[PDB]
Design a protein around this ligand. Sequence first.
Ligand code: HEM
Ligand code: HEM
Ligand code: HEM
Ligand code: HEM
Lengths: 141, 141, 146, 146
Amino acid sequence: VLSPADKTNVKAAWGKVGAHAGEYGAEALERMFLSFPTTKTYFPHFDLSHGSAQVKGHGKKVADALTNAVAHVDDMPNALSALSDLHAHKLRVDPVNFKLLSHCLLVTLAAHLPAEFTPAVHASLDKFLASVSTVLTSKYR
Amino acid sequence: VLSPADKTNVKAAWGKVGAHAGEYGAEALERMFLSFPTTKTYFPHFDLSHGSAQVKGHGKKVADALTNAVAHVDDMPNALSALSDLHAHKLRVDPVNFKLLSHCLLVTLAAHLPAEFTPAVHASLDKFLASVSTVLTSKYR
Amino acid sequence: VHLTPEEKSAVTALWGKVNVDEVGGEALGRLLVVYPWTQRFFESFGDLSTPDAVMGNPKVKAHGKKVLGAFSDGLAHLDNLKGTFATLSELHCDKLHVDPENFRLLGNVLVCVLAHHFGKEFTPPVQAAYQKVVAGVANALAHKYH
Amino acid sequence: VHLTPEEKSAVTALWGKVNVDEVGGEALGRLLVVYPWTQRFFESFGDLSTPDAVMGNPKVKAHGKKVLGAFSDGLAHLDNLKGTFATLSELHCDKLHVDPENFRLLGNVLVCVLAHHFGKEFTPPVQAAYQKVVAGVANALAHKYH
Ligand code: HEM
Ligand code: HEM
Ligand code: HEM
Ligand code: HEM
């Protein structure tokens, strides 16, 4: 349950990643693959090695999707609908990976937004990535 | 989200527990304390010995709560808002543990309604416990 | 894993009475039905469209039998689940690309199938010995992932 | 914990640059702030009503440096985390009644705090070695739960 402070919190940290959203995306993916090797089971077709053009492209796509969730915080359901569809019916990623990626993006942000990565903004983004997760795993069954 | 089909399956299985709900809730709790001892950290004041009146006493209440969510399948958030507040601000039970008690209630139903504990009914009841646990942990932060 | 012998014994005795042939088909079919995303791995299996399409698919029933015999071997080497399962661990990883969380879902479904079958005979205590085993087998299978 | 000596060297190097006073107050602080239900255990620190109330409490602080120092101690024993934390494990189980799941939460918060701090230096590869550590310590603390 995103509160108005939470929503604010989130619009300010994210407005700051700004033109770097894509690199933070590719970065959060590389930390996940290294820290949580099981998540690589989903990208058997990707070159997962360092600097992969595949992981890059992919980071951008994920970061683009976050950006749009940020700008529709208010109606994430409708805004992320094509995607819970994709995840639920085609990709079929087990719900537990959503938390692993969430953590990794939290860690990329801390490392890059030293000044804004405040405890209250930390609690907010955490709640944020958690509802994006719920929306994306909402049509699994 | 519970489909009509789910709702039907849950009323029907909950239907046969009938008068054993309390005895099944006591039994589910016992399974829980024994297959995952970590859940015992929340009942440091209780006698967790087999047959403990305290345990029977609590299984009934839990059983009662379930019976009422089934009773209001169409309004679970409002039928259970009070127990969410309890669990959320007074008790403060880590979410992971909702998954362990859901599993032990499935195991108990399976052990006693073999005739009804079918694959679709099992898919139904899993989605229902999942959705009851989701209401109980909605008000955490 | 660290079963106790009265734990090892209670697991052993019960396993004694299991029809592996039918019980494997059941735990595998139930997985596919309650956690429908797990069907992502069995597309060459035909119709998985409804519970009956899954539950009586002869392809599911026959794979279920292979999984439970492997499981069975496991119960004979409880002291050494890891090496028992290492070539199967490497297979699921490197060729199958199976997320290890599926090993945990399966164990839970199997405990559901032991209870459904044994009734009252599957007691809290027997349940606690089996929870340990399925966890031990999921860990042994996840062990060679990289 | 199966760390590489290359992973053991990256953990070790980073750890020698750690202000335990600042990192423990901060890690304990954000646990109470991100996961507000961990506050039922620290009721006695007193006023934990806000990030700022929390972050400010010198009890929270003195207690975060105390925790970070048991952590140090196990980084000196990577070889036997369990033997190093058995008593600490027994106290948290039998005395404080803490769900080991909270151990897990605290390791992730530690990792956000080391990142917050080393920015650029906390690479995926160093984050990965630290993930293993925090997982190892959580497990060792979970070990004497009964
Ligand atoms: C924060 C949560 C997530 C977001 C916002 C997200 C976003 C996206 C986006 C935007 C796409 C691209 C769709 C396209 O081109 O049509 C995608 C695809 C994909 N996602 Fe996710 N995702 C998330 C979680 C996950 C997780 C946790 C995993 C697995 C560990 C995963 C696995 C996949 C896979 C395998 C693909 C297909 C990639 C490809 O083949 O190109 N996703 N996701
Ligand atoms: C998802 C299913 C659950 C239901 C329906 C449920 C329901 C209830 C009910 C009806 C009560 C009694 C509150 C009162 O007196 O009004 C209660 C109290 C309690 N619940 Fe749960 N609960 C659930 C999950 C859990 C879990 C997973 C745990 C911990 C492992 C837990 C721990 C407790 C504790 C410690 C109490 C108070 C016991 C006492 O002090 O007497 N609950 N819950
Ligand atoms: C108790 C855990 C399990 C055991 C003991 C087990 C055992 C086996 C065995 C013995 C085989 C055949 C190996 C071969 O073809 O050379 C196999 C294949 C396979 N397993 Fe498992 N398995 C387990 C769990 C799982 C789960 C939970 C999944 C996915 C949900 C899975 C996915 C697969 C797939 C996709 C195949 C190959 C099927 C095909 O022939 O096309 N396994 N497994
Ligand atoms: C992450 C690993 C952890 C370590 C190494 C650890 C270590 C410690 C240490 C060194 C003490 C001081 C014990 C004494 O002075 O008698 C202590 C006490 C305590 N710990 Fe932890 N702890 C950990 C995690 C946690 C977490 C996450 C929580 C709760 C959310 C927790 C709850 C407590 C409590 C409530 C006390 C009693 C302290 C007091 O009232 O002064 N522990 N622990």
